[PDB]
């Protein structure tokens, strides 16, 4: 699980096939809840998926870009292009479902 920033967000996206981007903030409790879940996700799909984390407090223009207004927001990118969105703090199986739809 790596960090993405306003500078390298587009590099990372065009550099990897499948990228799961977690829009989060340090002060958010449902963020903290899915955080260990998303790295089990990272392990499970270690070779076909890159998990990235976007701090919306440090990267407001990136959050503004995709209009991420409420977090635990997870967006799936399939070829630099967004294909799935998960808006709540959710069970691991819900992420697994949308990842495998594009595997």
Catalytic residues, which ones?
28, 31
Q: Which two tokens stand for residue 34?
A: 């899915």
| Residue from 8, 70, 91, 100 binding Cl ion (CB under 5 A) | 91
| Residues 103, 77: Cα–Cα separation, whole Å | 12
Q: Which residues are CB-contacts of 78 (< 8 A; sequence separation ≥ 6)?
A: 17, 18, 102
User: Under the criterion CB under 5 A, does residue 59 sit at the interface with Cl ion?
Assistant: yes
Question: Smallest distance, Å, CB 52 to Cl ion?
Answer: 14
Window 71-90: residues binding Cl ion (CB under 5 A): 72, 88-89
Q: Which is nearer to Cl ion, 6 or 84 (CB)?
A: 6
Q: State whether residue 82 is helix, strand or coil.
A: strand
User: Under the criterion CB under 5 A, does residue 30 sit at the interface with Cl ion?
Assistant: yes
């Amino acid at each position: 699980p790596i960090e993405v920033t306003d500078q390298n967000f587009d590099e990372t996206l065009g550099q990897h096939p499948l990228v799961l981007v977690d829009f989060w903030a340090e002060w958010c409790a449902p963020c903290r809840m899915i955080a260990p879940i998303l790295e089990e996700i990272a392990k499970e799909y270690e070779g076909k998926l890159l998990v990235a984390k976007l701090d919306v407090d440090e990267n407001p223009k990136t959050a503004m870009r995709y209009r991420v207004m409420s977090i635990p927001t997870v967006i799936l990118f399939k070829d630099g292009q967004p294909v799935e969105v998960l808006v709540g703090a959710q069970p691991k199986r819900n992420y697994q479902a949308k990842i495998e739809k594009h595997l």
